[PDB]
Amino acid sequence: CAMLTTFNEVDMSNIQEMRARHKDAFLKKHNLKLGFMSAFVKASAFALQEQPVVNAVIDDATKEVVYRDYIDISVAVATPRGLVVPVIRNVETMNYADIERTINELGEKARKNELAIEDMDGGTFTISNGGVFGSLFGTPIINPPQSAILGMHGIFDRPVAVGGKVEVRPMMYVALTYDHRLIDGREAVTFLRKIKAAVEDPRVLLLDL
Amino acid sequence: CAMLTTFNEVDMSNIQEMRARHKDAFLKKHNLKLGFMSAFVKASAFALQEQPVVNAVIDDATKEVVYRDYIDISVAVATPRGLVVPVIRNVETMNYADIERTINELGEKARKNELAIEDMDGGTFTISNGGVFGSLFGTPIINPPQSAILGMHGIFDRPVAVGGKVEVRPMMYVALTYDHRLIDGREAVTFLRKIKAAVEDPRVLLLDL
Amino acid sequence: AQNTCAMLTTFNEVDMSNIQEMRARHKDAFLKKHNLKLGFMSAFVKASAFALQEQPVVNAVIDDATKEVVYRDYIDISVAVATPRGLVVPVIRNVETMNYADIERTINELGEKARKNELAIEDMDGGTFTISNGGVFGSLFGTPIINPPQSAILGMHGIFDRPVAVGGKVEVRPMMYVALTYDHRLIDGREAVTFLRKIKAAVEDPRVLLLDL
Amino acid sequence: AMLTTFNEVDMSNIQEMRARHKDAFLKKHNLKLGFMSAFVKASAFALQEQPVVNAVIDDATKEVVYRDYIDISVAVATPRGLVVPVIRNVETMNYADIERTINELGEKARKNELAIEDMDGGTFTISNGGVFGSLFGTPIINPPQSAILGMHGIFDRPVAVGGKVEVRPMMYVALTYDHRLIDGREAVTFLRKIKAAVEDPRVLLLDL
Amino acid sequence: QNTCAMLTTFNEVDMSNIQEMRARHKDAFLKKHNLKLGFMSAFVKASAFALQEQPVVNAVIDDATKEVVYRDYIDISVAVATPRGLVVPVIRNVETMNYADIERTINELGEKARKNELAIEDMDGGTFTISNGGVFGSLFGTPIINPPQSAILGMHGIFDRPVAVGGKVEVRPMMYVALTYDHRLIDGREAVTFLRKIKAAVEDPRVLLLDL
């Protein structure tokens, strides 16, 4: 076991304003609640596209890097009974209108206990959300056999310096645990920073920066 | 022939913001510059996706409405010898970066004039960027065999009303000339409204309203 | 359309301060008295009737078979309804008598009939003037399609808050563009411009209808 | 095994108490008031709320042993090194008794006359790393317990309370817990309960 | 994090003085000594004078089967880490106690170009006491490192961010950095780690306790 964790801060204001502006029409059309988790899942998929090493795995049996091209992100909808990780498959071709549908169905499966065995294995990324309980920032545990996991924590209003001026903005601490045997610090730090950039400004997803 | 025209106005404040913040990154990553045209092409593609009637064309030989799953926008490119209307195919599977790259390669082909006819046929929707030459608004001419075209114009700073206040915002007119036989009043204005919405904030495209 | 016939659509802006403020401070009594609704449809229809009375040429239709102008007298405003199955255009006859309330009653009746798909072919055609609505779907302005054999059509669009200079100072006022697609073969530029300006004057200040100006 | 999660506590009520009740303690109990007792009692309240954090995995026979007694193993600094005495049955003591036990353990520790029966049997550890001046960090779980709450320095830091920026005495609180017994949500709610109890001592009275 | 007793403790460092130092003296170094002022020359020095008092960090756990007796080394040698594209190596300064800030940067920079051209001899990487993880590349918040064995302790490089802070009970936005230090619990006490964390962050904002 070798878990290396890097933290970073994500400005939550842009996506909250987008939700407040577009929640009504989105709920009217797709019958879904607009949430901040779809933005994070899409950003994770995008950053995984840019940096495929985070998507790979090293087989301890043969000591060789095993690259994966398909992107599957497992979300944590952990039931009061215990921790459960439903898997979203092929997230690289979904928008914000999707993902929300998929997480809703997977949560429904978890509540009604149709979460079969195959729905929690074969994931390439994990987006465990411990912020629904108000955690400031903590270090999650790498889910085997995956090589990374992104931890989303609670949103709180803290003063942040913007252009030399103190402003109160809603900010999220985000964690990323990686195995240094495969991912070096440069790669994981860049990956987390790029996730932060994609969540902070959703237009880069359209610009492909 | 039987062409009707309807108008609206688009506020390019988010497009201006995203071209004020994401030019250095776009140039460093793609060796290419960012422009207004990609936003309008993507907005037209999204509107045609969510309203397949305008995407369809009535063939005069058999008087049949013909639907097409694919979308290919006939963007006009400026050349010293004469205006040309090439076609960029499958607009539904590309982001702003891909639109910019195909428009740049099309322009660099047109400058030295190696454009074959294979890149000029098969049009579904035409956009004429008349903003290079200062134009307030006016009725554009369609390029058949397609049904309706969207005519862009120049972007001028004009005073508008946002919450009762008067501020100067970069705002331009849009005209959608449509074949009145197939498209009636409601879709001819809803199409333009959706284009307006997707250009005012690109986050609608990502959120898929 | 464009080349098929003579459109020559003319445009004007109509402020909605008077009508909107009136309905804002007159709607409860109307709901307690007739019980339907209160809208600007009745105001625009009656203003069109007034302007059509003042300018009888726009009421007259041409007869291409004989090249004879037919000076129709009864005002037959044919309004449009944005039904789920596209759009339908019923008709209202003898508009001059109704003031605001009877036009509103006929509008409500015809809308309920169209929603129920009971609009008979009788009260569907034969109008002398048409009014379209591209206002429910907010459109800044557009070119209306002339409904034949009628000779003109009103194409009012949505109402937007825009900064408008009144007395040298910029103040935000509820504006809206209105279009008129006439027939240049019969109506000149002067007549169509005067028509649009008279409708603008009769909607900007409804007391003109009482004053007959 | 070891895994940690962090949070922050606004230490405004405790400093106000120490400001308004230091002389009353000095002249009624002959001991010095401190913010140790607030955290010990908050930890006791959280342990009583969640018995899972008070449990232990026995590697001898792979069993989950529950303990009814609550014992916080406070850390006492000595020149010879680091000695950790265990204060017993914390449920039945208020701030005064916690302070008395801490003073007694300090007096007995400085004299090198703390016996082996006073080291063992602990069920929860608290490591005050703030006497040296740390911002935050990771504590280690001393065997055979299951969690440790480490405190850090109390630093005046600007916080957005009510939408305005003000300088307030805040410290970072972290607990390191094993994942084989305590889940992530349990640890987060445990730390938040400690935060609530220290931030508002009247919660301990209201039992919520 | 388990590995071998790999806890971590965190702190912050004030870098208003150093950038104030560098905003006035950059031209002098370029003229007299032809090299540029960086950050590591302050952190590599702050660590070195933090080790000359408490040499338990210089101690390593060696002999047969590891834990037998301390091995105190009277020499200080800091292993700064520099990034290539060919995997980050850790270059190392020898007998660096007796040499000042400039000799720390001349040694660093010319030795940086010494590995930009792959002119490397393995004799220049012997197992010395201590590594200072040089992470001044990628603008992020708080890392955990992995004490580059056999080294016993480890330093971080975190990044300067404009952060609102309370200076003298007043809010004064300054651009700040965080730091951690990853200590092997075995024969390295928790309390002594905070003291060296503080002083490696005290000799940094007030550069003149190096003279005291």
How many beta-carbon pairs below 8 A join chains A and D? 54
Round to whole Å and give the CA distance between D117 and E210.
47
Distance of CA D56 to the CA centre of its chain: 18
Per DSSP, helices labelled H in chain E are: 16-32, 40-51, 101-116, 190-199
Per DSSP, helices labelled H in chain D are: 12-20, 22-29, 36-49, 95-110, 184-199, 202-206
E140–A contact, CB cutoff 8 A = yes
Round to whole Å and give the CA distance between B20 and B34.
10
Cα dihedral A106, A107, A113, A115 in deg (nearest 10): 30
Q: Do A138 and D185 touch (CB under 8 A)?
A: no
Q: In terms of DSSP bridges, do strands B3-11 and B165-179 run parallel, antiparallel, or are they unpaired?
A: antiparallel
Query: How many CB atoms within 10 Å of residue C61?
Result: 19
Round to whole Å and give the CA distance between A120 and A116.
8
| Structure tokens belonging to residue A199 | 């969540």
- Distance set, CA D66 to CA A80, D56, D71, D185, E178 (Å): 21, 7, 13, 20, 40
| Structure tokens belonging to residue E103 | 């000799």
Q: Do A136 and D192 touch (CB under 8 A)?
A: no
* Sheet of strand A148-162, all strands in order from the earlier edge strand to the far edge: A4-11, A165-178, A148-162
* Chain B environment of C4 (Cβ under 8 Å): 1-2
Picking from A184, A9, D7, D161, the residue whose alpha carbon sits closest to that of residue E176 is A9
| 5-64 of A, contacting D, C-beta below 8 A | none
Q: Do B189 and C1 touch (CB under 8 A)?
A: no
Query: Which active-site residues of A does the annotation give?
Result: 180, 184
What residues contact residue D206 under an 8 Å CB cut-off, 6+ apart? none
Cα dihedral C192, C196, C198, C202 in deg (nearest 10): 150
State which residue of chain A sits closest to B28, comparing Cα positions.
A209
CA distance D27 to chain E (A): 32
Picking from B20, B4, B55, B8, the residue whose alpha carbon sits closest to that of residue B173 is B8
* Contact of E47 with E78, CB cutoff 8 Å: yes
What residues contact residue A88 under an 8 Å CB cut-off, 6+ apart? A41, A72, A73, A74, A75, A94, A99, A102, A103, A106
Round to whole Å and give the CA distance between B117 and B109.
12
- HSE-CB at E31 with a 13 A cutoff on CA atoms is 4
CA distance D173 to chain E (A): 12
Mutate to test the interface with E, among D167, D170, D172, D175 (most CBs of E within 10 A): D167
Picking from A165, A2, D187, the residue whose alpha carbon sits closest to that of residue E1 is A2
Q: D35-62: string of b/e by CB count within 10 Å (b at 16+)? A: bbbbbbbbbbbbbebeebbbbbeeeeee
* Contact of D185 with D193, CB cutoff 8 Å: no
Query: Helix E40-51 to helix E190-199 angle, to the nearest 10 degrees?
Result: 140
Q: In this structure, what are the phi and psi dihedrals at residue A160, rounded to the nearest 5 degrees?
A: -130, 140
D99 DSSP 8-state letter: H
Per DSSP, helices labelled H in chain B are: 14-21, 24-30, 37-50, 52-55, 96-112, 185-200, 203-207
What pairs with residue D137 in β-bridges?
A: E9
Q: Which chains touch A (3 or more CB pairs under 8 A)?
A: B, D, E
| Residue with token string 């290079």 | B132
| Structure tokens belonging to residue C92 | 């209202």
Round to whole Å and give the CA distance between B34 and A106.
39
| Structure tokens belonging to residue D205 | 């009275």
E185–D contact, CB cutoff 8 A = yes
Contacts of residues E154-159 at CB distance under 8 Å and 24 or more positions apart, as own/partner, are E154/E181, E154/E182, E155/E43, E155/E47, E155/E131, E155/E179, E155/E181, E155/E200, E156/E180, E156/E181, E157/E39, E157/E40, E157/E43, E157/E133
Chains D and C touch (3+ CB pairs under 8 A): no
Burial of E34 from C-beta contacts in 10 A (0-12 / 13-18 / 19+): exposed
What one-letter code names the amino acid at A137?
F
| Structure tokens belonging to residue E107 | 């040694």
Q: In terms of DSSP bridges, do strands C160-166 and C169-175 run parallel, antiparallel, or are they unpaired?
A: antiparallel
- Give the 3-state secondary structure of residue C131: strand
Longest dimension (CA), chain C: 54
Round to whole Å and give the CA distance between E49 and E207.
11
At how many Å resolution was this determined? 3.1
| Structure tokens belonging to residue C121 | 């072919």
Picking from D42, D87, D95, D96, the residue whose alpha carbon sits closest to that of residue D69 is D87
Identify the H or E element spanning A194: helix A185-200
Q: B64-93: string of b/e by CB count within 10 Å (b at 16+)? A: eeeeeeebbbbbbbeeeeeebebbbeebee
State which residue of chain A sits closest to B39, comparing Cα positions.
A206
What one-letter code names the amino acid at D138?
T
* Contact of B177 with B139, CB cutoff 8 Å: yes
Q: In this structure, what are the phi and psi dihedrals at residue E202, rounded to the nearest 5 degrees?
A: -105, -40
What pairs with residue A168 in β-bridges?
A: A159
Q: In this structure, what are the phi and psi dihedrals at residue D200, rounded to the nearest 5 degrees?
A: -145, 95
Q: Which chains touch B (3 or more CB pairs under 8 A)?
A: A, C
- Distance set, CA A191 to CA A128, A141, C19 (Å): 17, 18, 58
Q: B118-127: string of b/e by CB count within 10 Å (b at 16+)? A: ebeeebbbbb
Round to whole Å and give the CA distance between E180 and E197.
7
Reduced 3-state DSSP string for D119-168 = CCCCCEEEEEHHHCCCCEECCCCCCCCCEEEEECCCEEEEEEECCEEEEE
Show the CA angle centred on residue E120, arms to residues E117 and E121, nearest 5°: 165
Query: Which active-site residues of E does the annotation give?
Result: 183, 187
Indicate the residue of A134, A139, A156 with minimum beta-carbon distance to D188. Answer: A134
C154 DSSP 8-state letter: E
Q: Do D137 and E165 touch (CB under 8 A)?
A: no
State which residue of chain E sits closest to D75, comparing Cα positions.
E191
- Give the 3-state secondary structure of residue D51: helix
Round to whole Å and give the CA distance between D204 and C197.
77
Q: Which chains touch D (3 or more CB pairs under 8 A)?
A: A, E
How many beta-carbon pairs below 8 A join chains D and E? 60
CA distance D69 to chain E (A): 28
Round to whole Å and give the CA distance between C195 and C54.
8
What residues contact residue B100 under an 8 Å CB cut-off, 6+ apart? B30, B32, B33, B34, B35, B38
* Contact of E82 with E40, CB cutoff 8 Å: no
- Give the 3-state secondary structure of residue B152: strand
Round to whole Å and give the CA distance between E9 and D150.
11
* Contact of E70 with E162, CB cutoff 8 Å: no
| Structure tokens belonging to residue E52 | 């000359």
CA distance A144 to chain B (A): 32
Through-space distance between the first and last CA atoms of chain A, rounded to whole angstroms: 34
Phi-psi region of D137 (alpha: psi -120 to 50; beta: other; left: phi over 0): left
Burial of B166 from C-beta contacts in 10 A (0-12 / 13-18 / 19+): middle
- Give the 3-state secondary structure of residue B81: coil
* Chain C environment of B184 (Cβ under 8 Å): 86-87
Identify the H or E element spanning D5: strand D2-10
- Distance set, CA C42 to CA C157, E150, E171, E189 (Å): 15, 90, 62, 88
Picking from A41, A70, A43, the residue whose alpha carbon sits closest to that of residue A56 is A70
Q: Is the dihedral of CA A191, A192, A197, A198 positive or negative?
A: positive
* Contact of E104 with E93, CB cutoff 8 Å: yes
Q: Do E164 and A164 touch (CB under 8 A)?
A: no
| Residue with token string 């008709």 | C91
Picking from E43, E19, E38, the residue whose alpha carbon sits closest to that of residue E174 is E19
- Distance set, CA A52 to CA A47, A65, A66, A179, E154 (Å): 8, 12, 11, 15, 29
Cα dihedral E47, E48, E54, E55 in deg (nearest 10): 120
What one-letter code names the amino acid at E25?
H
What pairs with residue D164 in β-bridges?
A: D161
CA distance D92 to chain A (A): 30
Round to whole Å and give the CA distance between B57 and B174.
22
Identify the H or E element spanning C49: helix C41-54
| Residue with token string 């400039």 | E102
CA distance A87 to chain D (A): 20
How many beta-carbon pairs below 8 A join chains A and E? 60
* Chain B environment of C163 (Cβ under 8 Å): 159-161, 166
Indicate the residue of A18, A96, A201 with minimum beta-carbon distance to B208. Answer: A96
Per DSSP, helices labelled H in E33-154 are: 40-51, 101-116
Query: How many CB atoms within 10 Å of residue E155?
Result: 27
Show the CA angle centred on residue E34, arms to residues E31 and E39, nearest 5°: 110
Round to whole Å and give the CA distance between E124 and E87.
18
Q: In terms of DSSP bridges, do strands C129-131 and C76-79 run parallel, antiparallel, or are they unpaired?
A: parallel
Active site (annotated) includes residue B22: no
* Chain C environment of B164 (Cβ under 8 Å): 161, 172
Round to whole Å and give the CA distance between C63 and D150.
96
